[PDB]
Amino acid sequence: SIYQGGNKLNEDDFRSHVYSLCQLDNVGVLLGAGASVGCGGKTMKDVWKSFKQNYPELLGALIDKYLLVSQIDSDNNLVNVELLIDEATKFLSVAKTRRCEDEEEEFRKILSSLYKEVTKAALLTGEQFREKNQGKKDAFKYHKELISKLISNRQPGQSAPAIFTTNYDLALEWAAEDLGIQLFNGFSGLHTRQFYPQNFDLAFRNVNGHYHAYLYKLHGSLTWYQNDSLTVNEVSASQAYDEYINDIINKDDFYRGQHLIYPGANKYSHTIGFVYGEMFRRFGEFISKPQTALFINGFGFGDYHINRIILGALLNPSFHVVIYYPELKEAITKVSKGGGSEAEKAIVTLKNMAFNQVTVVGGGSKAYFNSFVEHLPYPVLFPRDN
């Protein structure tokens, strides 16, 4: 629930709040890991569990040789993988300057298998993934709802809603032409498609219908890769499945960064990709807009740049924010005894920030994509005095 000075609050207040915020000029939707959980998605903990189960030798070596993770820490349920890739890369640069060969196989296989597992926890449908007609499955219904609601609540003089989703899975570009609404992905042509960031000026206008939305993913894509020519590309899904996913899954060759996405601890250790620059240019250039609203469904509070380029620029009271945090009382009790991770402590700032223009939203599992897109209203035509 919501408390204000020791008095309970009703849901209608928050409903009217979000309705009015949507009525503001600009709006944006942030979508974290919770963007797709009911479609078959899994959290990083499940990825690590599958990684350790598939290759127990790696867990044994970690327990014995180096101890980059402790059993008690895993029991505490705080295992982090984001630091493990960067640890491995720093280790391997050290070895490349040291020339220790007999100890490389362990870590190179660790990289290969970890990337395999991470890429495996996002298809959400297994073999069913490959065939067509998936776009019409009941699983992807809510994405259609969002693709409809916010794309038409745009009277002349207002910009289209912003998409900010940062997960592995593929669920945003398959409800697009199912209902015909293009959440712009920007890849022209039929056979040879190239990525051109200069396509940031797309908008339909009726000259002689008038539907557009805005895509901005803070995760890369499950099908973005570098071909040694300094390029990135997303193409059809089953095409990639039949092309290169099988090679990574089975062959497990000496790993080069076949398809580049950056789930890890330090992004700048992956500074080869400046598209991070563009995406966070957008997300740091949007918070400053006055009379703008942000609907945050799934902000894990774990990443650094997100949690440092939110508060650092909230200091103008015309941009309005709110987050859907499932566990309110449990999280408050946990934080009162020391806090959680390094970045999530920023919640305390919003628990105590000097902006009387927000209020936390929670309740538990009832604040995911489903309710997030269901609780919004539909545009009303022909208002009457009443």
The one of a second copy, ligand NAD, none whose footprint includes residue 257, by CB under 5 to 8 A per kind, is none
Among 159, 303, 340, 376, binds ligand NAD (CB under 6 A): 303
Closer Cβ to a second copy, 49 or 193, answer by number? 193
> Any contact of residue 265 with ligand NAD (CB under 6 A)?
yes
Helices marked H in the chain — which ranges? 11-23, 44-54, 56-61, 71-75, 82-98, 104-120, 141-152, 237-240, 246, 275-286, 304-308, 329-336, 346-352, 369-374
Distance CA 300, CA 286 (A): 19
User: How far does the chain reach from its first CA to its final CA, in angstroms?
Assistant: 33
Q: How far is the CB of 53 from a second copy (least distance, A)?
A: 24
- Specify the amino acid at residue 221: S
Say which residue the tokens 């991470």 belong to. Answer: 118
Closer Cβ to ligand NAD, 23 or 80, answer by number? 80
**Between β-strands 7-8 and 361-362, what pairing exists: parallel, antiparallel or unpaired?**
unpaired
Angle at 314 between CA 34 and CA 156, to 5 degrees: 80
**Contact stretch for a second copy (CB under 8 A) within 3-11, 111-119, 245-253, 305-313:** 305-313
Site for ligand NAD in 200-229 (CB under 6 A): 218-220
Distance CA 115, CA 117 (A): 5
**Between β-strands 214-217 and 292-297, what pairing exists: parallel, antiparallel or unpaired?**
unpaired
Among 6, 12, 75, 230, binds a second copy (CB under 8 A): 230
Site for a second copy in 189-208 (CB under 8 A): 189-194, 196-199, 201-208
Distance CA 282, CA 197 (A): 13
Site for a second copy in 277-296 (CB under 8 A): 277, 280-281, 284-285, 288
Say which residue the tokens 């903990």 belong to. Answer: 45
Closer Cβ to ligand NAD, 134 or 166, answer by number? 166
Site for ligand NAD in 266-285 (CB under 6 A): 267, 273, 275-276, 279
> Any contact of residue 252 with a second copy (CB under 8 A)?
no
Contacts with a second copy: how many residues (CB under 8 A)?
110
Site for ligand NAD in 60-89 (CB under 6 A): 77-82
Site for a second copy in 128-167 (CB under 8 A): 132-136, 144-145, 147-149, 152, 159-160
Q: How many residues does the chain have?
A: 386
The single-letter DSSP state of residue 323 is E
Among 4, 250, 336, 356, binds a second copy (CB under 8 A): 356
> Any contact of residue 306 with ligand NAD (CB under 6 A)?
yes
Give the C-alpha distances (Å, rounded to integers) separating 359 from 34, 303, 330.
Answer: 21, 22, 17
> Any contact of residue 298 with ligand NAD (CB under 6 A)?
yes
> Any contact of residue 263 with ligand NAD (CB under 6 A)?
yes
> Any contact of residue 355 with a second copy (CB under 8 A)?
yes
Q: How far is the CB of 81 from ligand NAD (least distance, A)?
A: 5
Q: How far is the CB of 217 from ligand NAD (least distance, A)?
A: 6
Beta-carbon contacts of residue 123 (< 8 Å; ≥ 6 apart): 40, 129, 169, 170
Site for a second copy in 58-97 (CB under 8 A): 65-68, 86-87, 90-91, 93-94, 97
Residue 46, CB-side half-sphere exposure with 13 Å CA sphere: 10
The one of a second copy, ligand NAD, none whose footprint includes residue 70, by CB under 5 to 8 A per kind, is none
Site for a second copy in 25-64 (CB under 8 A): none
Contact 82, 263 (CB under 8 A): yes
Site for ligand NAD in 140-199 (CB under 6 A): 166-168
